[PDB]
Amino acid sequence: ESERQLRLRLCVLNEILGTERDYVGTLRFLQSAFLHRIRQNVGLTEENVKVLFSNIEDILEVHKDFLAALEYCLHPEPQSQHELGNVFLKFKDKFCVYEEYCSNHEKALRLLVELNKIPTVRAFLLSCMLLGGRKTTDIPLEGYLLSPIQRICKYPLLLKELAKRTPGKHPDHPAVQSALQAMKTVCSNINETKRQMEKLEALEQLQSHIEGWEGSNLTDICTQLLLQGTLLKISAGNIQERAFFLFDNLLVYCKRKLYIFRGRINTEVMEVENVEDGTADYHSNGYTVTNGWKIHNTAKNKWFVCMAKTAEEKQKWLDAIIREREQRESLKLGMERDAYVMIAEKGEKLYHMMMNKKVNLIKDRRSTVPKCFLGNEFVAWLLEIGEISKTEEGVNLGQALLENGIIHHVSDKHQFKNEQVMYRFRYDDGTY
């Protein structure tokens, strides 16, 4: 099985590199979309930025060199002979940059909650993420502000797995084990990361007590266990008692023996339905249901019935299941509502701003095309007027206007580009 422990090591190496790359990119997005753009065109005060982002720029400079040494050891590719323990050890002292950030984290969130109450500041914050390239309906800024705390806690989890796939023969063995101990002591010193590490430890401890795990690791999809309990899975032809675990974003049912993995469901495709005590239907295999409900895997269009011992447990479960749905569905729908309002606002604003003869850009050009403007001119005018800083920001803005039904190509055959492609506001041609 030596080759098994080999490909397994490379997967760890490939992951450490690929995840570190996406981390630095996330840091490089936070400064360009936020810290840099406001430090140029000076409703977000300077103190507001210092509170929200703290030393995120110092964290970047550290991880910009970490990634270099990571790619340095893993050149030309992630090869098994390559050693990575020394890298973590010679950056172990530089990781104290997380001290100030994790301290200011609570204060930053408190500010963000009050800033999001102001509609103009919420829109500006969301406008920064749009211009920076990243989608606004995906991860909220609260999550971006936390990813430093998450990343520094993902290092012990990654090094542990690497140490498992690294034999005592490999010269990196004394270093990987020494680096794992050092990375743990880093997180343990900081209070904010200590709470995070113990929350990730719980997810991984549970996954270790489950045999035959299939799918993505809990530490990569969930954050906390919501409810655990043993129920009856009256699936078609299989009425067996199962141990159910409800996390955020995932539900998994196991076979109690420690547990043995049986199946898992993503809560996004899960739809529950109550069955009154005394009901008997096909999903219950004909048996009378008491203190039970019904689950529907809308991905597979499969229904299966759960039953609890007490009616308290039924309510305890049904209540916890509804909460998870509402919590994530409110966030998602909320980010998607607060993002349409800024585009509609900026769309109507830039329309009237462009209609004035000071910078007339929606001119009837030529067959004649009425009330059209040029993408090249539009992007340039945005930088002149100061609404954007880079040109990549201008196309990201125009595309968001095209996608959100504000503008469109004259022939609806092109997306937004910095070329002299003619676009028109959907107001002028009655398509709004």
Residue numbers in the entry: 42 to 83, 90 to 304, 467 to 575, 579 to 644
How did the manuscript describe this experimental structure?
Nevertheless, in a breakthrough, splicing T4 lysozyme (T4L) into the unstructured β3–β4 loop of the PH domain and deleting the first N-terminal 40 residues resulted in diffracting crystals and a final 3.2 Å P-Rex1 DH-PH-DEP1 structure. In the crystal structure, the DH-PH-DEP1 domains form a closed triangular topology with the DH domain intercalated into a groove formed by the PH and DEP1 domains and an extended PH-DEP1 linker helix. In the autoinhibited structure, the final DH domain α6-helix is broken into two halves at residue Ile237, forming a closed helix–turn–helix hinge. The closed hinge enables the DEP1 domain to interact with the DH domain, forming a DEP1 latch that further stabilizes the closed conformation. Conformational transition to the active state requires a complete, roughly 126°, opening of the helix–turn–helix hinge to form a single extended α-helix. Hinge opening results in rotation of the DH domain away from the PH domain—this transition enables GTPase binding and activation. At the DH domain hinge region, the conserved hinge α6-helix closes back on the main body of the DH domain, burying Thr240 in a cleft formed by DH domain helices α3 and α5. Extending along the hinge helix, both Met244 and Leu247 are intercalated in the DH domain surface, further supporting the closed conformation. At the DEP1 latch, the largely hydrophobic α4-helix of the DH domain is positioned in a cleft formed by the PH-DEP1 linker helix and the DEP1 domain. The conserved α4-helix residues Leu177 and Leu178 bury a combined surface area of around 200 Å2.
P-Rex1 and its close homolog P-Rex2 are highly conserved GEFs that activate Rho GTPases (Rac1, Cdc42, RhoG) to coordinate cytoskeletal organization and cell motility. P-Rex1 is a 186 kDa multidomain-containing protein with an N-terminal catalytic DH domain, a PI(3,4,5)P3-binding PH domain, tandem Dishevelled, Egl-10 and Pleckstrin domain (DEP) domains, tandem PDZ domains and a phosphoinositide-4-phosphatase domain (IP4P). P-Rex guanine nucleotide exchange factors are autoinhibited, synergistically activated by Gβγ and PI(3,4,5)P3 binding and dysregulated in cancer. P-Rex family members are autoinhibited under basal conditions and are thought to be synergistically activated at the plasma membrane by receptor tyrosine kinases (RTKs) and G protein-coupled receptors (GPCRs).
